[PDB]
Amino acid sequence: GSKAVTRHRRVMHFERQKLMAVTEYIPPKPTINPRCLP
Amino acid sequence: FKTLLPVPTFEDVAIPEKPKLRFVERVPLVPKVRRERKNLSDIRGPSTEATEFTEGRFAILALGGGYLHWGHFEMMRLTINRSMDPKNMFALWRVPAPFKPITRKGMGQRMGGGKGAIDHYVTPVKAGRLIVEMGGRCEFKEVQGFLDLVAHKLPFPAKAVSRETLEKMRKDQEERERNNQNPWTFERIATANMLGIRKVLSPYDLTHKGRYWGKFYTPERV
Amino acid sequence: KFTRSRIPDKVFQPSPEDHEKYGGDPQYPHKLHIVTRIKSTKRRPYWEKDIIKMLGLEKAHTPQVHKNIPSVNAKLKVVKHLIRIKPLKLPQGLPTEEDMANTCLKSNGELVVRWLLN
Amino acid sequence: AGSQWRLQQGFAANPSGYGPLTELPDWSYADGRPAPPMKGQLRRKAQREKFARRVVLLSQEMDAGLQAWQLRQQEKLQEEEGKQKNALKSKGALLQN
Amino acid sequence: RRAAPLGPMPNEDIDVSDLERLKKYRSFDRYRRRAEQEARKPHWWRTYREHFGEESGPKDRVDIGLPPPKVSRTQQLLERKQA
Amino acid sequence: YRSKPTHGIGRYKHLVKAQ
RNA sequence: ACCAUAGUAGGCCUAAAAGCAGCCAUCAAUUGAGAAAGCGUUAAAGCUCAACAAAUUCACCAACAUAAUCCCAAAAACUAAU
RNA sequence: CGAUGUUGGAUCAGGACACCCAAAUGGUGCAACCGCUAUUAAAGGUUCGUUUGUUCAACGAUUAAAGUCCUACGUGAUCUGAG
RNA sequence: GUUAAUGUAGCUUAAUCAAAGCAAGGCACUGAAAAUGCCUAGAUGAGCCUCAGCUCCAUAAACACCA
Ligand SMILES: [Mg+2]
Ligand SMILES: [Mg+2]
Ligand SMILES: [Mg+2]
Ligand SMILES: [Mg+2]
Ligand SMILES: [Mg+2]
Ligand SMILES: [Mg+2]
Ligand SMILES: [Mg+2]
Ligand SMILES: [Mg+2]
Ligand SMILES: [Mg+2]
Ligand SMILES: [Mg+2]
Ligand SMILES: [Mg+2]
Ligand SMILES: [Mg+2]
Ligand SMILES: [Mg+2]
Ligand SMILES: [Mg+2]
Ligand SMILES: [Mg+2]
Ligand SMILES: [Mg+2]
Ligand SMILES: [Mg+2]
């Protein structure tokens, strides 16, 4: 078992990994790119 | 042909005496006799103290958590002291001298037998804290140039920032989190204990919101 | 320590869009719950196991009906990740005593009183 | 597969549950006399009944609950006036004026 | 987990900053008085008075009396001063 | 009790400085 | 890409300090070029930077070697997938 | 632990490359000869003696060179037994 | 001479039992304070009226004024 804090970045429990992968930031995507607009 | 622009002028900058960084001590003047347990919890999560500017307009900002020992202080002091114009710039410690005893045992000891003996002292640094604060009649760019060296040689990941740069990245940080397209945020899920997810999470997570993990802080995490 | 968990009341304040979304009436709450146990109690804390027992949810994918009163909603709140709740609907209204043999419960969550006439 | 589609259409997610496929009496004598009923359908009848009976019961209990509360409210409001009708006529301060 | 006080906390009024410039009761007795006055006020937390039966607490009194005798305030005052 | 609204009602020592 | 001439070796300390060991001022000619941001000299001379004019796609940060019998499924960027 | 026999030699070596030699190159405070570095390359090589049980190590003589290691500190149902 | 207010004891009560509480004083007691004990002075701004009304005086806050 490892301390809560550690040097080496500490592999997460798989479920927590899923949780992290689900909650990622999704940038808003405009319908038309402002550059190809007039 | 190119048209000129008004140059930034500093008439309001007052330079203090002893603009260079003070020498800090290897061991405190009243050395701690009683050996302390190690809170790792003082490196962990966001920082409360020393998050803001005081006198100066530039700083080194700590993006990770870590421990600063005397070697680090020496490095910063020497580097900054010979990389600045003592006339036009001044620097300041935003960090206390190392106060926290850290033990060791002689290499080759068996497990058990007692606690160790006090080897050296350190300072705990939580992510989001200013290490060193530089003011002056300087523009940010020069200071940035040499400060990034120091920043790079610190134990944690760190950056060189100005007031402008800091507020920029904070507004960007909150704007990223009100822009977010996906309905599902770490906060929303953890606080409501969806999927019984609390089972795998730490209590501290409710505050940390998936942005801090151990001593690591990933700014991209909303 | 891993422990029980408070669930701040802000979670249960519904937004105006939600009514449209899940098809509830903004004015009048529904009378009855259809609860189904969707997940398993294994690998979950003993207190959730007990709640699931006392809700009559022991067996999976079997519907069970409960009052919409707060006393029950407390327990459902505890195990809400293990279950599926859908409001019971009565298109033909409540069953009389002539209709007891012919009742049936459709997956859209509605109780049909007259089942298979001639 | 295809449970989702079966659900949108209001059927059972499983072709086995409650459709005409299952419920109907799959055989009969050649003469036309009905066959003894089927054990499965018998049990399904019983517990479907059980379920309905319960729905009725809970509905009724909840109603009777609400009525009882409303009644207690009326009783409170009635006692508040029951104090005033039964009270004595205030005199002392008013008689001098 | 902190909750929020409902209404005023008792000592929240006086300034902790600069204690030396605050007047104290050096008398035990002054304190006793102030305390007994404080114990008569209707606080928002569970109190002795609440459980031990102030006997209906606040009560609007239906009064069947003889009207109080009408006497001049100022005149009476003057006479007594004189006496 | 920490959870309650009435917490720290008996708190005094900040009123008298004896050190 | 292009281009570089003026008081003047500015005043000091030093064997010499000529924009450029150091300390102090940092003014001033010409449309325009710092008492000079880098190289260079014993002190220079000499190369460039910023300045005019000439023009103008975009240009902030980001890259990181390895082990011991023999690599290790095969493969594959679209015919409609909550 | 109802036994996975242990140091150094002998014999036979299998492998890595973090190259000691042989090959091809970059940089030099590379004139030449020497060198000092760095890249690429593992098919083949990598001595004989005096003393130590010795591995190391010192020393004599040489070599194109006398590599660093892994293999139950390779290898005792093949040997040795100095320790 | 004009506007917003007032005149409770030094600060705040009450004005249907009643002008109340606290400061503030003296003497005694121990070195000073402090506590304690025995003591001390006190007010509804002034003139009429009706059984709140009319003025005056004065303060205060401004403005005008005067020097
Ligand atoms: Mg553990
Ligand atoms: Mg670093
Ligand atoms: Mg069966
Ligand atoms: Mg140029
Ligand atoms: Mg390499
Ligand atoms: Mg293969
Ligand atoms: Mg053994
Ligand atoms: Mg055996
Ligand atoms: Mg070999
Ligand atoms: Mg190589
Ligand atoms: Mg060679
Ligand atoms: Mg070889
Ligand atoms: Mg070994
Ligand atoms: Mg061996
Ligand atoms: Mg052997
Ligand atoms: Mg063998
Ligand atoms: Mg009176």
CSV table of C-alpha atoms (C1' of nucleotides) in Angstrom, one decimal, chain B residues 1-4 87 141 144 148 152, chain G residues 23-24 50-56:
chain,number,residue,atom,x,y,z
B,1,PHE,CA,7.2,52.7,-42.5
B,2,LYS,CA,5.9,51.7,-39.1
B,3,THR,CA,4.0,53.9,-36.6
B,4,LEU,CA,5.3,54.0,-33.1
B,87,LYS,CA,18.9,49.3,-9.4
B,141,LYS,CA,9.7,39.8,-20.5
B,144,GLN,CA,10.4,36.1,-17.4
B,148,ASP,CA,11.9,30.5,-16.0
B,152,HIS,CA,12.4,24.9,-14.2
G,23,C,C1',31.4,54.7,-11.5
G,24,C,C1',28.2,59.1,-13.1
G,50,A,C1',17.7,48.0,-33.0
G,51,A,C1',16.6,53.7,-37.0
G,52,C,C1',15.2,55.4,-41.6
G,53,A,C1',13.6,54.3,-46.1
G,54,A,C1',11.8,49.0,-48.8
G,55,A,C1',8.2,46.0,-48.0
G,56,U,C1',4.9,43.1,-46.0
